[PDB]
Design an enzyme around this catalytic site. Structure first.
Site, PDB file in Angstrom:
ATOM      1  N   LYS A   1     -16.161  -1.969   1.679  1.00 40.29           N
ATOM      2  CA  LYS A   1     -15.237  -2.464   0.873  1.00 40.29           C
ATOM      3  C   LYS A   1     -16.253  -3.169  -0.259  1.00 40.29           C
ATOM      4  O   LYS A   1     -16.755  -4.191   0.022  1.00 40.29           O
ATOM      5  CB  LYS A   1     -14.282  -3.607   1.450  1.00 40.29           C
TER       6      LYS A   1
ATOM      7  N   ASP B   1      -5.170  -0.805  11.909  1.00 38.23           N
ATOM      8  CA  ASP B   1      -5.742  -1.893  11.446  1.00 38.23           C
ATOM      9  C   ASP B   1      -4.967  -3.170  11.960  1.00 38.23           C
ATOM     10  O   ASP B   1      -4.085  -3.673  11.198  1.00 38.23           O
ATOM     11  CB  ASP B   1      -5.612  -2.088  10.049  1.00 38.23           C
TER      12      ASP B   1
ATOM     13  N   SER C   1      -5.734  -4.237  -0.436  1.00 44.62           N
ATOM     14  CA  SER C   1      -4.482  -4.235  -0.560  1.00 44.62           C
ATOM     15  C   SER C   1      -3.995  -4.489  -2.014  1.00 44.62           C
ATOM     16  O   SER C   1      -3.004  -3.781  -2.533  1.00 44.62           O
ATOM     17  CB  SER C   1      -3.811  -5.304   0.326  1.00 44.62           C
TER      18      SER C   1
ATOM     19  N   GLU D   1      -9.023  -0.506  13.822  1.00 47.05           N
ATOM     20  CA  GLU D   1      -9.791  -1.408  13.122  1.00 47.05           C
ATOM     21  C   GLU D   1      -9.190  -2.832  13.417  1.00 47.05           C
ATOM     22  O   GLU D   1      -8.433  -3.155  13.817  1.00 47.05           O
ATOM     23  CB  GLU D   1      -9.525  -1.264  11.595  1.00 47.05           C
TER      24      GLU D   1
ATOM     25  N   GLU E   1       0.805  -1.396   0.034  1.00 48.30           N
ATOM     26  CA  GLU E   1       0.075  -0.107   0.111  1.00 48.30           C
ATOM     27  C   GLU E   1       0.795   1.312   0.090  1.00 48.30           C
ATOM     28  O   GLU E   1       0.539   2.284   0.115  1.00 48.30           O
ATOM     29  CB  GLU E   1      -1.133  -0.104   1.193  1.00 48.30           C
TER      30      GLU E   1
ATOM     31  N   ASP F   1     -14.200  -4.572  10.066  1.00 53.86           N
ATOM     32  CA  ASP F   1     -13.670  -5.021   8.355  1.00 53.86           C
ATOM     33  C   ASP F   1     -14.104  -6.499   8.344  1.00 53.86           C
ATOM     34  O   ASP F   1     -14.850  -6.688   7.730  1.00 53.86           O
ATOM     35  CB  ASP F   1     -12.287  -4.763   8.357  1.00 53.86           C
TER      36      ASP F   1
ATOM     37  N   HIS G   1     -10.030   0.891   0.148  1.00 52.56           N
ATOM     38  CA  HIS G   1      -9.657   0.171  -1.164  1.00 52.56           C
ATOM     39  C   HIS G   1      -9.236  -1.346  -0.236  1.00 52.56           C
ATOM     40  O   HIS G   1      -9.608  -1.943   0.568  1.00 52.56           O
ATOM     41  CB  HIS G   1      -8.141   0.794  -1.358  1.00 52.56           C
TER      42      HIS G   1
HETATM   43 MG   LIG Z   1      -8.642  -4.301   7.431  1.00 48.86          MG
HETATM   44 MG   LIG Z   2      -7.932  -7.696   5.364  1.00 47.67          MG
END
Ligand SMILES: [Mg+2]
Ligand SMILES: [Mg+2]
Ligand SMILES: [Mg+2]
Ligand SMILES: [Mg+2]
Lengths: 436, 436
Positions: free
Chosen positions: B345, B246, B375, B295, B211, B320, B373
């Site tokens: 997502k 995250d 990865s 996250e 990223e 997530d 987004h």
């Molecule tokens: Mg995540």
């Molecule tokens: Mg993931």
């Protein structure tokens, strides 16, 4: 008719500001973005930077952007230029700047308008950009040529740690039958290389450089090349993938000698190589590895070193910082017999017309032409259409990682798909792709 | 009218193939590309892969592509659907699949058509994409709300070679007054972090992860957080930049416990943390560092841990892998009070309609929404328009490096510019940007 010309600041793949231009006509709004190299050739057209240390590390492009909005825009729109006439478009821009190296308005201010005009013209003519570029360049009507992509899968020199002096190690799937296959092949080799690199050097090394290739702490060129060969073999493509190099030798040229250990503050000066010695080293690499192209093997103004090596090189020798996509320097290279291939970078000269001119002068001298991106790229995909329009058969636009690279490669897939049977893949004949 | 639906394979930022769809109407050709995550949530909609070891490392998407061209395209074209009726478009696609997780055609076959149709509809309506998406989701546009970018500038977890268990360390310029200022600040902090990383850890550490963030071999989160703070201070943006995290805890959740040393094969099982114990660690990180968002701090199905933490966690808690942008999963999270923000997502669910429903259900529950987004990204910029259309006030689209990331960020710059006084920057009210 062009009703408006507008520029704005956007960010390139390195997170540094660059110029984006939009040209408006009855066909819509056409956008073009300017790339940016690092440690650029001393002879490149001037890339204008703000220098405001309190903004963008002093890399702002506000001045360039203003030059487009307050200088070029009003004049260009009032001139009512025919965008289909690229030469007229660029003569106006060049004449508005009035300087030899475009230092007044800035190359990064001029190029955007130049490229965006060609897109507006293509739409006016209702044809794909690459077709219009072919018309502008007087290229063969058919068959179109899909280029062999030289993928910079392993970085060295200034793009990585270790002692490795050479900047770029590329793979070129010349053995593929189509571009789509070459690209698949290239990605497979790349994934095998990344897994091997992480296994031998660690996760850290597995990470990518500016152009998407792995950057492990390698000690020697032979170590790098053996790793590339292992990746090819592991991928099952031995015999179908060749290697290209971008030495960027000007980076380690000192006192008429070349320091292959310039990253070591305490490099042994008694071990610095002379022109002939550096040439012999390339020969030894060429004898052991499937190297078919070598870029900037010698300094940007070390003509005698280029000419000596060219006498026995035996493979494509690409001039980059030596020629800086400048017809005047290309003439010199031809006269001195320094190389036989031009790395074409539109932002090194500033206009599309001049770039096309550099390509024509090169082909006219029996040279090859490798269209290239810059280390700092964007989501713009102009060079994809440019390499097809010029039918060069070869392009350098990064490793198959990072979308400022994939954007171009994906665009080539769409062009190939669209061309259908009206196209051929350069393959082994990449050097003379235009003769195909 | 939709005269044609076509899909082809293209490459994402990691060099892996993905699906690209083009929908043709009287307004032209509209293209959308499907993103791809790694170590994806177990509950995510199906990303169909070929599994042919002799092609693309077994990661081809020919099956998905064929589902589009052979199954979806014919039925879709014959159904003569009104692209402006996104609900109708997505009900048709979902009905064609007939499965709960799109296991028949694949989410990576359906999503491209769903997205392309919304682009075609926007053109039919003669309005910019974010405008059409604001209408589709019934979002307020007087004024529009621009998001605060959460840039993953420091990589960890399975994305690093150290012991750092946490996957993503992001910076959020909540102190900026405009999106443009926020992005410059973010890039400035990023560049400071890079050089500081190379000097303290070495060039190799300077290399970027998938990223665009740096990936130094750090051992603890504290060490990583201190580095980010020094970067913010060095850039001169103290107090204007906050941190996001995250944890992607599902990655180190083993035997009902959390192993913060899951990268070492000899990890001490007697030191593995428990639900409550992991919370104590986050709590202390939050007290000492400017952390405003965390996250996936717990397993994708370990609801109890999530509920317990939310009790005293005084910051935004993003879901997530727990919710996978699935309205059903979200309902459970709402009722159990596991978190207060959804990571949106589109490819985790498969259609735009379902993603819009997820966002709406979230906002209706007082939740926040961060558009994200994957990865594995592409040159596609859909999420830029979607985050503005959904008025969320926050987006995660990568570090200010690599164009699959800058493409979205630059597009937000364009949207801000075009909107002018019609838009406001969410800043510190990013959590409830929709209520701004
Ligand atoms: Mg995540
Ligand atoms: Mg993931
Ligand atoms: Mg260079
Ligand atoms: Mg070069």
């Amino acid at each position: 008719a062009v009703s408006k010309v507008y520029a704005r600041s956007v960010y390139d793949s390195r997170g540094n500001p660059t110029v984006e231009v939009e040209l408006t006509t009855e066909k819509g709004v056409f956008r073009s973005i300017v790339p940016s190299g690092a440690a650029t050739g001393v002879h490149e057209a001037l890339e204008m930077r703000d220098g405001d240390k309190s903004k963008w590390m002093g890399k702002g492009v506000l001045h360039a952007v203003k030059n487009v909005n307050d200088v070029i825009a009003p004049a260009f729109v009032k001139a009512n230029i025919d965008v289909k006439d690229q030469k007229a478009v660029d003569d106006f821009l060049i004449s508005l700047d009035g300087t030899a190296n475009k230092s007044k308005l800035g190359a990064n201010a001029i190029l955007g308008v130049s490229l965006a005009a060609s897109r507006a013209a293509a739409a006016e003519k209702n044809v794909p950009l690459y077709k219009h570029l072919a018309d502008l360049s007087k290229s063969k009507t058919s068959p179109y040529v899909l280029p062999v992509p030289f993928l910079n899968v392993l970085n060295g020199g200034s793009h990585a740690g270790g002692a490795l002096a050479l900047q770029e190690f590329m793979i070129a799937p010349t053995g593929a039958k189509t571009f789509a296959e070459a690209l698949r092949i290239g990605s497979e080799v790349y994934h095998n290389l990344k897994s091997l690199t992480k296994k031998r050097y660690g996760a850290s090394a597995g990470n990518v450089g500016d152009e998407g290739g792995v950057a492990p702490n390698i000690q020697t060129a032979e170590e790098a090349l053996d790793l590339i060969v292992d990746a090819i073999k592991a991928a099952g493509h031995d015999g179908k993938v060749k290697i290209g190099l971008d030495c960027a030798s000007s980076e380690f040229f000192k006192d008429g000698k070349y320091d292959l250990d310039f990253k070591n503050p305490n490099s042994d000066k008694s071990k610095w190589l002379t022109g002939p010695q550096l040439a012999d080293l390339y020969h030894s690499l060429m004898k052991r590895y499937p190297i078919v192209s070598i870029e900037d093997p010698f300094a940007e103004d070390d003509w005698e070193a280029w000419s000596h090596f060219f006498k026995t090189a035996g493979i494509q020798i690409v001039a980059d910082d030596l020629t800086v996509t400048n017809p005047k320097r290309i003439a010199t290279a031809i006269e001195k017999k320094a190389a036989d291939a031009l790395l074409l970078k539109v932002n090194q000269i500033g206009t599309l017309s001049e770039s096309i001119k550099a390509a024509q002068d090169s082909f006219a001298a029996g040279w090859g032409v490798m269209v290239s991106h810059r280390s700092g790229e964007t989501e713009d995909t102009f060079i994809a259409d440019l390499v097809v329009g010029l039918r060069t058969g070869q392009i350098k636009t990064g490793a198959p990682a990072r979308s400022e690279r994939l954007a171009k490669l994906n665009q080539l897939l769409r062009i190939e798909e669209e061309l259908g049977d009206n196209a051929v893949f350069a393959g082994e004949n990449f050097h003379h792709g235009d003769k195909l």
